[PDB]
């Protein structure tokens, strides 16, 4: 048991790597997207802004027209440590991308709604002058 | 030796980092989930405006 | 370019025209122009780093927009004004936001009303230090979020409420909130791991009870000796409950010293821990 | 010295433990973020396109007054 | 702006015009005006947290919207009504949602139809406790997700289907679902990762077979000992199969006690494991 | 409400009006009416799970839409039809997509064009099993992504290109891609750690070169000893480079067996490693 | 079909009408028509990866789009042009972007102006190698982000500013930025982990000081050795502060060697540590 633990747990330290390494792989796909999506939402936000503009004009037109075993076991830890730093790297990129976009969602939701109203009002004045 | 009894918290601390990382992302899911029902539903009304604006074109233009 | 010139023209145009100017129609088209003017001014006032001017300017464009009937985009302007005063030097940061919510709310827009509602309680706390009003907002806002089924968001707000509820001596009312947010976070296996801290806080918050409650809540909690995360929740609590029931202000302040290694204590914990450490002494020397 | 060798193991496992679970989170993570990634691919679609529907409307309205 | 007053006037205008009122044109807008009224009512109903009334109000504005020809924004209203009743104290949350899907479905919006379809099967279970219909919904819904390329969501629902299927005696149908969701997961080397647990559940689910359906399912499972994820799926299973295919009831009950360390046993696993612990004993005085 | 009926009416209206029925103004509205018809049909064909019919129906509404002069919303339909045929039983899945890209591409929409371009190369591989055509698409698509300053996406595609390029036979053309994707990865500290596997793959890929392209590629790599991420990359490579430069198919196959402990090998690696194993055996009884 | 043909038609129509041809309304429909033409051409140019032609074409359409009177859509077109030129053959990538911000900024759109502003400073460094002009942008942009209360992004920029400020000998101006970004980071318990590196950088940046500018900054840093995260911050620092106060270019050069084990040094640290390494030597033989 004594050795079945100083080695088995040692295998866990070795595994402790792929465990925190597979996490990076899982983090990459996330970050890679969070970044890709970040730029996407930029062109997406343009939509809420593009519509925000046109609607103003559209409304006006509708208004104008409407009217050594332990030595290694100690090293593996250092390995985990070096990787722990990485976990911080992603934790920040993921964090700064989350907070920057959440607030972006706010602006999107705002303008989107603001324009929704203009569409409804215009749709109630246009539907009548149909055909 | 001591590194073992020590490094133990070097991860228990990260276990907390992800605990928030898993939550942060999930919080965005709901923010984007609702935005998915108000943004898509938004253009839905735009479709009504596209049809209305198209007809006002075949009568006054 | 010249804000001091735009503001002037701005007022010179925002006025119900008459005589030959009014003709047959007049109002909306004009007042809107002024709104755009003041926005244009407030912008350069923002780059100029005047802020105060920018804020009051947005307030002008905002108020004006209402005189044209457009509560929507108007309220969003009030948001701009709030953002201005916020990162500015004068006050009014709270007023603009109140003028924003009074609009979004009555308009049937609770999804966004809560969005600025939390920002509000956040300013009313971090700045005004008006906790009594902040809690009222964090709460009502959480109710709105809970209506949209935006669970997580609502929980964020609830956590704020309870968290600042224990600081205002409201310990019992805090544990109750932790109970609610705990029962509405188990069905989701994405909050399992997190439900711990809740039980830890709730067990820590003491309304000066002299018996179980915490010893009962720690029991209600589901743990297994091989648990990893659970080690950062009740395992500590038990030891604290024993150091309390035995009025030993030496075993409590010691175990907290050990726990401050595997899981560092945040400001909150420290504050409450010291309060409990004092309750022990206030029972010893009594 | 045995005592230290046994106490060592005790702390090592308690460490090994906390580890395995943290790994459990990322697994669920990659399954969540991705499940959300597809929820955005349609957004970008419905957005830049809605810009076309609105653009076609604002254009027709203008050429309906001049 | 009295609620019940709005509810009255809304009724005053929600009706085919006639006499001098009808005048020249009809009133396709009248019905719309009424819808806006009831919405204004449900607004303040949701204000005083009277939800019940708010929900019943939205039901009205929604029903009326249909009588106008506008299924879209109507169905969305049915959703508002559902969210209301849901968070509210009465029922109706089930009716509103059904009346919502019939619209998102006939119209052509299966994406959102399934979005509410899962909410439905989730309520028809955690509330009404009607699994026989819940599973039916979890399934049809997963079908819709599986047609929107959205693999993740599809599997999300399938897991529910099989999950609650084995908890109803449908053990075999469960393993089959696990096989399907297991095959439609390998195509994506990003799911290789979760594709374990499926084999574990499927191997655990037993329809009282006398052969080695599980010893075979664990075999089909590709694993490598140095691997980790895998050690959290079949490894235990093998030991469980030996304790079962060998008729021993200490090694199974103790192996389930050991695995509970490296990997915490959720509710599901527990229940089923006990069922097997009993197939052992049941096999015992047999 | 019958699809079969709608498909007929649509046809009756989709046709350049002739004789008096035409007059002066064409049927730009009629063609649109037909599009709406077929759309409604494809719609109920999708609820019936008749997929085939749904897809072909969308194809009809789409083609007609083109005959109306509206490439945008047309292409959108082409996509809908693709999503249908894909999760269906007939073909056309590849055709609809190509017919969609020709539109997004000539319309000024490359972002979405590439979005469907990768989907295409993904189907032409996971279905048609046409690797050579799929690579061509993964490549041309990565060009567009990389143009939309979406380096992230660009590499996501390049990895596919090289990945399957080493599987076909193109080992060299693979390493070149790994070199490019490797140089354009360091500019982002968010891919440093991942930039390893790239060097591992590129060093593994061999186009039957006699020099030390690998011994050079491994040297180009920057590693030390206290690095643990790097431990899963070149450290192994060197051992493999020595086992190859010594025609010892017993040291190479042993080292792969050891490395397969600390870092589980995947299908790709396995296949290539065996290829290198045969080049060695093939150098020994040689 | 061909772009070369479109560019031609677009040119023959992009001419302000006068005399009889102008009639009552020359209209901007012509200039806009040409804009659509050039856009259609620039895209197919982006297909054949002609880039140069694509970019210049977009510049044409955008330029005309200004003559149209619609600064907005034009601005984003300039962005399209920038997206082309950036990943192209010629330059202009910097021009288009400047021509875009001059529009977003004056239009009152700082939110997006900063979005492209950072991209700008990101190119003016990794390409033009014009740090002095890059920092100015990273900074002004951070000012905008900070104006939009977007703390996260603002810090993303500040880190860049100070990060490259220390490279340009601006050490004190760097530490100040680190101190600010450090104080405005504690108020947020979601940055605690990162707040270390800040103190490490600031304690490393030295404006030729000889006192305890860092020995005081290391004290201000609340730490507890068995924290690890912190070990990757001040520990080394302390050992560096002793090696400098003793003109030891051996203990410092050894400490950098040892520290480069548990936590690798990035290019930044390398360059600075070397500068500090020289401040010691030059002090020895002085």
From Swiss-Prot, chain B:
**Keywords from the UniProt entry:** Acetylation, Cell membrane, Coiled coil, Cytoplasmic vesicle, Membrane, Phosphoprotein, Synapse, Transmembrane, Transmembrane helix
Q: In which tissues is it expressed?
A: Nervous system specific. A higher level expression is seen in the brain as compared to the spinal cord. Expressed in hippocampal neurons.
Question: Which subcellular locations apply to this protein?
Answer: Cytoplasmic vesicle, Secretory vesicle, Synaptic vesicle membrane; Cell membrane
**One cellular component term from this protein's GO annotations in UniProt:** cytoplasmic vesicle membrane
Site entry: (Microbial infection) Cleavage: 30-32, 38-39, 48-49, 53-54
Topological type in the membrane: Single-pass type IV membrane protein
Which biological processes are named by the entry's GO terms?
Answer: calcium-ion regulated exocytosis; cellular response to insulin stimulus; eosinophil degranulation; establishment of localization in cell; exocytic insertion of neurotransmitter receptor to postsynaptic membrane; Golgi to plasma membrane protein transport; hormone secretion; long-term synaptic potentiation
Positions of the v-SNARE coiled-coil homology domain: 3-61
Describe its PTM?
Phosphorylated by PRKCZ in vitro and this phosphorylation is increased in the presence of WDFY2. (Microbial infection) Targeted and hydrolyzed by C.botulinum neurotoxin type B (BoNT/B, botB) which hydrolyzes the 76-Gln-|-Phe-77 bond and inhibits neurotransmitter release.
- Give GO terms: molecular function aspect only: calcium-dependent protein binding; calmodulin binding; identical protein binding; lipid binding; molecular adaptor activity; myosin binding; phospholipid binding; protein-containing complex binding
Per the record, the domain of life is Eukaryota
- Which ranges sit in the Cytoplasmic compartment? 1-61
The record's similarity note reads: Belongs to the synaptobrevin family.
Name by which UniProt lists this protein: Vesicle-associated membrane protein 2
The record lists the organism as Rattus norvegicus
Q: What is the lineage of its organism?
A: Eukaryota, Metazoa, Chordata, Craniata, Vertebrata
The residues of the intact protein that this chain contains are 29 to 89 of 116
UniProtKB/Swiss-Prot annotation, chains C, E, F, G:
- Any one Gene Ontology biological process term? intracellular protein transport
Main subcellular location: membrane
Keywords in alphabetical order: Acetylation, Cell membrane, ER-Golgi transport, Membrane, Phosphoprotein, Protein transport, Transport
Q: Does the keyword Methyltransferase apply?
A: no
Entry's InterPro entries? NSF_attach, TPR-like_helical_dom_sf
Which is one Pfam family of this protein? SNAP
The protein's matches in PANTHER family, at most eight in alphabetical order, are given as:
ALPHA-SOLUBLE NSF ATTACHMENT PROTEIN, SOLUBLE NSF ATTACHMENT PROTEIN SNAP
Q: What does this protein do?
A: Required for vesicular transport between the endoplasmic reticulum and the Golgi apparatus. Together with GNA12 promotes CDH5 localization to plasma membrane.
**Family under the similarity heading:** Belongs to the SNAP family.
Query: What protein does this entry describe?
Result: Alpha-soluble NSF attachment protein
What species is this protein from? Answer: Rattus norvegicus (Rat)
Q: Which gene encodes it?
A: Napa
Swiss-Prot record, chain D:
Compartmental location: Cytoplasmic vesicle, Secretory vesicle, Synaptic vesicle membrane; Cell membrane; Synapse, Synaptosome
Start and end of every t-SNARE coiled-coil homology domain?
A: 2-64
| Residues flagged as site, (Microbial infection) Cleavage | 63-64
- Post-translational modifications reported in the UniProt record: Phosphorylated by CK2. (Microbial infection) Targeted and hydrolyzed by C.botulinum neurotoxin type C (BoNT/C), which hydrolyzes the 253-Lys-|-Ala-254 bond. Cleavage inhibits neurotransmitter release.
This protein's superkingdom? Answer: Eukaryota
The record's disulfide annotation reads none
Q: So which tissues is this one expressed in?
A: Expressed predominantly in cerebral cortex, hippocampus, cerebellum, adrenal medulla and retina with weak expression detected in non-neuronal tissues.
From the record heading this protein, give the residue positions of the covalent cross-link Glycyl lysine isopeptide (Lys-Gly) (interchain with G-Cter in SUMO): 62-63, 66
The record's comment on protein family reads: Belongs to the syntaxin family.
What job does this protein perform?
A: Plays an essential role in hormone and neurotransmitter calcium-dependent exocytosis and endocytosis. Part of the SNARE (Soluble NSF Attachment Receptor) complex composed of SNAP25, STX1A and VAMP2 which mediates the fusion of synaptic vesicles with the presynaptic plasma membrane. STX1A and SNAP25 are localized on the plasma membrane while VAMP2 resides in synaptic vesicles. The pairing of the three SNAREs from the N-terminal SNARE motifs to the C-terminal anchors leads to the formation of the SNARE complex, which brings membranes into close proximity and results in final fusion.
The name on file for this protein is Syntaxin-1A
Q: Which organism is it from?
A: Rattus norvegicus (Rat)
């Amino acid at each position: 048991r004594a050795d079945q633990l100083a080695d088995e747990s040692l295998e866990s330290t070795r595994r402790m790597l792929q465990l925190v390494e597979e996490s990076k792989d899982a983090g990459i796909r996330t970050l890679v997207m969070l970044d890709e999506q970040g730029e996407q939402l930029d062109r997406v936000e343009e939509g809420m802004n593009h519509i925000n503009q046109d609607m103003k004009e559209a409304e006006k037109n509708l208004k104008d027209l409407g009217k050594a075993r332990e030595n290694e076991m100690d090293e593996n830890l250092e390995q985990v440590s070096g990787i722990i730093g990485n976990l911080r790297h992603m934790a920040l990129d993921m964090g700064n991308e989350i907070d920057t976009q959440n607030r972006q969602i706010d602006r999107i939701m705002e303008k989107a709604d603001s324009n929704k109203t203009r569409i409804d009002e215009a749709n109630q004045r246009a539907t009548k002058m149909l055909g | 030796n001591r590194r073992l009894q020590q490094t133990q918290a070097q991860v228990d601390e990260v276990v907390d980092i992800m605990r928030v990382n898993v939550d942060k992302v999930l919080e965005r899911d709901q923010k984007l989930s609702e935005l998915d029902d108000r943004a898509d539903a938004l253009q839905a009304g735009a479709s009504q405006f596209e049809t209305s604006a198209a007809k006002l074109k075949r009568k006054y233009w | 370019a010249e804000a001091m010139a735009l503001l002037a023209e701005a007022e010179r145009k925002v006025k119900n025209s008459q005589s030959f100017f009014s003709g047959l129609f007049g109002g909306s088209s004009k007042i809107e122009e002024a709104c755009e003017i003041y926005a244009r001014a407030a912008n350069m006032f923002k780059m100029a780093k005047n802020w105060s001017a920018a804020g009051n300017a947005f307030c002008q464009a905002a108020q004006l927009h209402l005189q044209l009937q457009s509560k929507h985009d108007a309220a969003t302007c009030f948001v701009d004004a709030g953002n201005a005063f916020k990162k500015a030097d004068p006050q009014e940061a709270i007023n603009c936001l109140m003028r924003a919510i009074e609009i979004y709310t009555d308009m049937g827009r609770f999804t966004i009303a809560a969005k600025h509602h939390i920002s509000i309680a956040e300013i009313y706390e971090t700045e005004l230090v008006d906790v009594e009003k902040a809690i009222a907002h964090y709460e009502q806002s959480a109710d709105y979020y809970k209506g949209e089924e935006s669970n997580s968001s609502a929980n964020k707000c609830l956590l704020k409420v309870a968290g600042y509820a224990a600081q205002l001596e409201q310990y019992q009312k805090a544990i109750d909130i932790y109970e609610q947010v705990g029962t509405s976070a188990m069905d989701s296996p994405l909050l399992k791991y997190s439900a711990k801290d809740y039980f830890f806080k709730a067990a820590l918050c003491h309304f000066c009870i002299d018996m179980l409650n915490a010893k009962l809540a720690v029991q209600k909690y589901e743990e297994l000796f091989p648990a990893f995360s659970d080690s950062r929740e009740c395992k500590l609590m038990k030891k604290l409950l024993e150091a309390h029931e035995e009025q030993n202000v030496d075993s409590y302040t010691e175990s907290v010293k050990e726990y401050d290694s595997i899981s560092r204590l945040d400001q909150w914990l420290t504050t409450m821990l010291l309060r409990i450490k004092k309750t022990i002494q206030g029972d010893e020397e009594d | 010295a045995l005592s230290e060798i046994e106490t060592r193991h005790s702390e090592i496992i308690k460490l090994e433990n906390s580890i395995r679970e943290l790994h459990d989170m990322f697994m669920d993570m990659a399954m969540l973020v991705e499940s959300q990634g597809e929820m955005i691919d349609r957004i970008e679609y419905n957005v830049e396109h809605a810009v076309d529907y609105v653009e076609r409307a604002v254009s027709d309205t203008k050429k309906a007054v001049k």
